[PDB]
Amino acid sequence: GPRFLVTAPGIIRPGGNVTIGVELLEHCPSQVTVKAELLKTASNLTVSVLEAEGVFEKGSFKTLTLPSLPLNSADEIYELRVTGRTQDEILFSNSTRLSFETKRISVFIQTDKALYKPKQEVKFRIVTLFSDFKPYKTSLNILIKDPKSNLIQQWLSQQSDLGVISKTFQLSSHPILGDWSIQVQVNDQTYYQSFQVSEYVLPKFEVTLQTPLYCSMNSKHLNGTITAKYTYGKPVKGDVTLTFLPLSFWGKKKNITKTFKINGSANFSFNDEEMKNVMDSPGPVEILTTVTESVTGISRNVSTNVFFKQHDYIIEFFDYTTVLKPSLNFTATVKVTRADGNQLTLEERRNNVVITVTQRNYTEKMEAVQKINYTVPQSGTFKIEFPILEDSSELQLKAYFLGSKSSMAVHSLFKSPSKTYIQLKTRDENIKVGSPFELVVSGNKRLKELSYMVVSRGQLVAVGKQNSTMFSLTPENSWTPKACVIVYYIEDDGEIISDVLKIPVQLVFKNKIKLYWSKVKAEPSEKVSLRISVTQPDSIVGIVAVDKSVNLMNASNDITMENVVHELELYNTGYYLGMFMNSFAVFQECGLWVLTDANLTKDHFPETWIWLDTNMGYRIYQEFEVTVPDSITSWVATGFVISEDLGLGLTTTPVELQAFQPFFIFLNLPYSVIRGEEFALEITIFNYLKDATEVKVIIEKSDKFDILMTSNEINATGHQQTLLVPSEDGATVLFPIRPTHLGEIPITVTALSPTASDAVTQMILVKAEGIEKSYSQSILLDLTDNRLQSTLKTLSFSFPPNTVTGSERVQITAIGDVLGPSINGLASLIRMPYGCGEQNMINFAPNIYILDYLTKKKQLTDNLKEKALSFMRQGYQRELLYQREDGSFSAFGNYDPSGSTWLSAFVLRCFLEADPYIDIDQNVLHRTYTWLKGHQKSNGEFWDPGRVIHSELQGGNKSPVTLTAYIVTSLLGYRKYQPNIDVQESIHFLESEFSRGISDNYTLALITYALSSVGSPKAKEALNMLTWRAEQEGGMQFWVSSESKLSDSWQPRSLDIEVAAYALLSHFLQFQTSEGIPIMRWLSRQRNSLGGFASTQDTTVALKALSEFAALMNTERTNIQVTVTGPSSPSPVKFLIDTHNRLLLQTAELAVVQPTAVNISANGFGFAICQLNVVYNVKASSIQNQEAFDLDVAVKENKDDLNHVDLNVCTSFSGPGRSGMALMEVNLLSGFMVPSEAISLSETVKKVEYDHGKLNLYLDSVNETQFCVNIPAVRNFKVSNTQDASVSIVDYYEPRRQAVRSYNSEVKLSSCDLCSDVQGCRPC
């Protein structure tokens, strides 16, 4: 008879012990020894990697566990060989292939949110656990990818402490929207986790559109309620425009227009016949509704999908035994419900379900269609348990009920020659780890000593023998997430009677964590404490706390039991046996290879509050104090704990804290107001109680504004107003406020309810009328010479006659470094916006140059280093937006017709220079270089297919020379990645063009810089020729290029600054310092109050030049005592500059007098820059003044209408040919906003940016043909006595080519139109 039944799983997994079940039956000779070995057939040879051996006794089902394969093993040809021998005979010796499973460890990536906004911090944790949820100490590499698959930021060789790595990643202001990715590279495997980044637009008001998802054709009443409500809680009293349309292409797809007043939330009861007509299983009905408030002009839309059930009743079959074993009892829990969701018990029971049983013998013999009437229970799962005849092959159950006469067919007859069958079954549902569960073994014949075996995650985790038909098993963590219990025994004839039950085992963790809130309900901005109680000391805990609104989207970025189950389900993988009609199939159904001599025959943006990460040491209980955020929400806290001994443990339930207040105050402030205007502060009191309350709103009296409410009551000045707030919102109390002082003003509104009180303080910026003008004058106190111990300079400025009194502001700064002022103003070097492609580099390349200068000078502080690198990463993230699909970079990304070689070269050079500091994706560099090198002509000339944005390089005459000289310099930094960049023909072309004769200063400067960078022998001649054209004046060298359309200003042209910077770089690259110093002196004295130069490009080039050249100066000691005494500073203001405060920008606010003047007296050694900054506002503003642009703003708006102001801005460029990229800044009138997508992008308007009451239009180019753009603005705040706003168009790369005009609406709100109908409020 049979003697052995050695069974092994068919898979191999690194890090998992291979266990082999050995059963020696009764008719076995003696104690055998079973050896097992894992052979690796990598090459043609076979290497016995692992092996095990054991002596097993007769009549005992035991296990043989191999040593675990090392976790770093790769996919090889693995073959498990088992050989069992006794004192003489070898009973069996066989081998089989093992399928390789690459899921070795469990890696969880936990981001605090699934959906992110721009300017948000992605906080992410990485948890690395073994298959048994113990911490896995390893060195992982973290990578972050944007949706275009660009390496944004990586961390390398991160050593995980108890398997947990906590990190943060700062998103930029304008990232690439889409699905980002986090990749964790443990060993040779990579684990992914995507988080979505999407832009957030203010929804204004929301619509709910509640409808039942599953309805029935026979349901008379169907209603869809649409709840329109403003964000402040007030319902919208608007007329819904509704379209109730199907997607049934065979139908008409007409829309029933139930367009009337919603009145907050109305009923929309429908008719059955009407819906039959509209229909004439459907495509789901799409409900689309829209409310449009007339004044705002804003409309919100929602799509709601409504599927359809055929009948009023729904009968569904599940939990059915997929194997039809004759002489056994079929069982299936069949649910009865109704499309409305209300079973209604007796009322819809209507007596019995016949549950027609169709038994068939599958002939072409025993054909029975008998029906058994059974009553419907209240639960609906009647769980019929009818028997099966001895030869029934096919079963069809047809439950005939009043609705949904559903059918089910099962066709799988288990084949057994002896007609012997068993069946493993379970009654329990909550099958957990450590909790025993019962198993019942039904059988149609005599049952012998059963033998069970459990397979889980492709590993044989338990064996044994049971002598009874009812036995209990206790799962362990290895059994999860889905065990497979195979019960079998062997009859006398060597037939294996067996059955499989697949049991979902719930996972219970030994490690336990409990979170407790101090208070279940707390007020906002209250200090509560979160209490963490863990099992054992030396545990690392990660706790997240998020708004209750989350999880309605089923966010996958959290360590919850669902995510743990999903992770564990990746272990349980393998081919599944569709058929189970034989014992061999029964064994194989859970991946088992059986070696036996028996007859085995083949046949929605949720904000985050707490991101706590604490390494609890000796403590098993720790309390952390936190502040409840101001918003009225509900915060649920969840967390995990990891310890070395017990492993992982999750919180069973999230614990909730309700942030509740009796009422809440909302203020609606205009952000900016001009001095002299009178705005209307509206305060809204959202009342959350269930009964009307009488709140009392008070504004704290301040000297920086006057409230115009001349109250009727005596004593009280009208700063207080009492009102009755009904339940659930309703208050819009208005205070007319006239600011008096300028700057930032705080307004503090305090509401005193009888029960509670609250206060809200908000800041309003009050500016001065007119256009803001600036002046800056710098001097370099070059006290290095010992003879020049004392130095006296004078800085003067005379205000224009049309200055706005009170808007003047004079200050003076001193700093002890040549590149000083650029250090402080790294965050913002220029006042222009940088939403375009090239301009964004103004927050990137200067960081490179400052870090290079400070590292060379050995003065780089850690804090400044980290700030600079953070700016570098933000600049890189923002810049990668403007990369086109063909690898190019353009000024406006993919909106441009084609990329620009000039800007691609600029970005390539900057990224190559930023390699040693931050991490740049090399694929971006490779694609950019590949795109560039296709544009080199036969003679070496580079040409730019992109749109001209810099008229000097790209446009004008000598364009090929400047483009070649720029791109040749930019490509040299790529010689690291490719030592054979063939630019010798380009160099020869530049040399020939230089020998031709260069007249312009800018072209010659670029030629000199190119020839110096490539070390061409003509470079010395070019630089000598460029120097001799300079202006030697006052120990300074500079180049002045004349133009008759530049507004007079302190600052020179961008072209002149670039010329000086390139000449200085040429002097540096040729190792000529003494004759380069004057250019350094001049270049250092032409910066603005922010430490930057005029435009973006000139600023980057000049900062590069000053960083490269200032590093060669000797400033080892500097001790300067600057004294500032003059008419504008009566008291002598003294700045001390030492070797410690070298980079400190020492500032002092001077008085305002006409004319401003200061004498600066300095004594000592070293370099010091002293700068006088004046900021003022001229009153008002083509004509005889020097303006390159002719601008005209015509405000056309009806006098009767006070809410809409449409202005037509017509501009033209009276200059040589076309201009470069231009910027139009439209300042809106106080209390006016331009709705989004109001200005359509066109061939001219390339980008519209909506700042706070300001529009930045990036015009492509302006020429002599008049270009007119319409700006429609809609009132959102009531502001009386509005002051004139301004429209200013400038050339981006030459700000002195500018034109500014003033405008104002011809109709104004009066002083007392601000007040509402409230009593006691009398401004007129």
Ligand SMILES: *[C@@H]1O[C@H](CO)[C@@H](O[C@@H]2O[C@H](CO)[C@@H](O)[C@H](O)[C@H]2NC(C)=O)[C@H](O)[C@H]1NC(C)=O
């Ligand atoms: C290049 O720069 C030099 C130096 O500023 C310019 O030379 C000056 O040109 C102006 C206007 O023609 C004269 O009034 C000065 O006397 C010149 N100063 C010199 C030669 O030292 C030169 O014009 C510039 N060239 C171009 C093409 O812009």
Ligand SMILES: *[C@@H]1O[C@H](CO)[C@@H](O[C@@H]2O[C@H](CO)[C@@H](O)[C@H](O)[C@H]2NC(C)=O)[C@H](O)[C@H]1NC(C)=O
């Ligand atoms: C600032 O400097 C100016 C010029 O260097 C000084 O003006 C001279 O002052 C002296 C003495 O006060 C007079 O004798 C001269 O006639 C002045 N010349 C001019 C052109 O004004 C001025 O006094 C200095 N102011 C301070 C406060 O030191």
Ligand SMILES: *[C@@H]1O[C@H](CO)[C@@H](O)[C@H](O)[C@H]1NC(C)=O
């Ligand atoms: C599993 O394998 C590891 C390493 O191969 C070994 O240390 C351990 O003892 C094995 N487990 C059993 C139960 O033999």
Ligand SMILES: *[C@@H]1O[C@H](CO)[C@@H](O)[C@H](O)[C@H]1NC(C)=O
């Ligand atoms: C096992 O080995 C025997 C003897 O070499 C062979 O007859 C049989 O086909 C092998 N495979 C099995 C039993 O699956």
Ligand SMILES: *[C@@H]1O[C@H](CO)[C@@H](O)[C@H](O)[C@H]1NC(C)=O
């Ligand atoms: C099967 O059902 C029949 C009839 O309901 C019952 O007599 C018998 O005991 C049942 N057997 C099992 C194993 O459920």
Ligand SMILES: *[C@@H]1O[C@H](CO)[C@@H](O)[C@H](O)[C@H]1NC(C)=O
């Ligand atoms: C001005 O630019 C517009 C827009 O491209 C073009 O249609 C027109 O021909 C240009 N006119 C001149 C004189 O350059």
